[PDB]
């Protein structure tokens, strides 16, 4: 999914040397997502390199039986700050551009998200990833703490 | 000798070093380096007195009448 296409420029004695930057995110819509960035002369080739880069950067988002987040979480990258919190089933995914495309492409069905701080599409994508990467799932906190599930549920 | 750390002894040592410093501050008026110290030490003594007034009313009044220390500024 192409999130953003921009025309960045290097400048040479001749003139303006134009390239396209592509910010693209890949997912299966099944709980696997990644971001990648690429640069080329034509839209098409940039897009492609973006794809290939993302595919080698990719991670998994912890999901709950209703397709949402285990818990509330913040995230920080650059000036991008990101806030995600789980939602009741049937609220869909409400968020802004980077955060929402990444979330949606992961397959998260119901989530609240807001990016505070900056708006750069890219850093918000990365940030989202750092958010959902640090998501601990209950089985694992029960494994860490060394305490049975039913005890923490309470 | 007595208590060398006692409130009243300390306040004495201070009052005394101050009245001593007074003569030097009178003879050489341009020495600000020294005056700054005076003001510091006077501050210390004033603090101890406030403390002692909090802790024991009697020992305090006895002391400031004894060492001829000016009455406190809480009035």
């Amino acid at each position: 999914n192409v999130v953003q296409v921009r025309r960045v420029t290097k400048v040479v004695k001749g003139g303006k040397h134009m390239r396209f930057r592509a910010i693209v995110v890949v997912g299966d819509k099944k709980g696997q997502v990644g971001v990648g960035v690429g640069k080329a002369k034509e839209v098409v080739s940039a897009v492609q390199k973006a794809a290939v880069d993302a595919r080698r950067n990719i991670i998994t988002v912890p999901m709950t039986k209703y397709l949402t987040f285990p818990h509330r979480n913040e995230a920080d990258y650059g000036a991008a700050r990101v806030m995600l919190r789980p939602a009741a089933p049937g609220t869909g995914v409400i968020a802004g551009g980077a955060v929402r495309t990444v979330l949606e492409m992961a397959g998260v069905e119901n989530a609240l998200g807001k990016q505070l701080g900056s708006n750069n599409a890219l850093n918000n994508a990365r940030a989202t990833i750092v958010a959902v990467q640090t998501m601990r799932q209950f089985s694992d906190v029960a494994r860490d703490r060394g305490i049975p599930m039913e005890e923490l549920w309470k | 000798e007595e208590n060398k750390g006692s409130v009243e002894f300390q306040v004495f040592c201070f009052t005394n070093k101050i009245r001593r410093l007074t003569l030097h501050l009178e003879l050489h008026k341009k020495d600000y380096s020294s005056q700054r110290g005076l003001r510091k030490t006077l501050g210390k003594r004033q603090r101890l007195l406030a403390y002692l007034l909090k802790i024991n009313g009697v020992r305090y009044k006895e002391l400031i009448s004894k060492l001829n220390i000016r009455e406190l500024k809480t009035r």
Partner: protein, 133 residues
């Protein structure tokens, strides 16, 4: 050392972020109880006491590095709440719960220190010391 609680917390947070298992902290009724509780929740390996020159030190062993020091998925967070500047209290129906209950909230109440779990069982509110992830 204007706040003692916050300071203990901090010594942990710091020693934790620097990948050390061993911390020296200064003991106190509060300190000791908090650490006990930390052990019965299971955020920390082992505690013990030491004494020298009428000083008490609780040394804390800490949960080992996560399958190396470089690749850490998890850290162990701590946050002061009621602090000398603003003291936060809560009744029974506002008692906090952390990350849906994955983490724990420490409360000082009339029945002593506890977690939010205990407070819910016994029906008590009180002063919220800190949160733990």
């Amino acid at each position: 050392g204007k706040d003692t609680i916050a300071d203990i917390i901090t010594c942990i947070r710091n020693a934790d972020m620097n990948r050390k298992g061993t911390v020296r902290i200064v003991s106190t009724n509060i300190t000791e109880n908090i650490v006990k509780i930390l052990l019965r929740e299971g955020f920390i390996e082992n505690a013990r006491k030491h004494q020298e020159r009428n000083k008490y030190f609780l040394v804390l062993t800490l949960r080992h590095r996560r399958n190396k020091k470089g690749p850490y998925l998890n850290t162990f967070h701590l946050k002061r709440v009621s602090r000398p500047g603003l003291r936060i209290y809560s009744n029974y129906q506002r008692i906090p719960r952390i990350l849906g209950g994955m983490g724990i909230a420490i409360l000082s109440t009339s029945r002593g220190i506890m977690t939010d779990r205990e407070a819910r069982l016994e029906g008590i509110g009180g002063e919220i010391l800190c949160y733990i992830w």
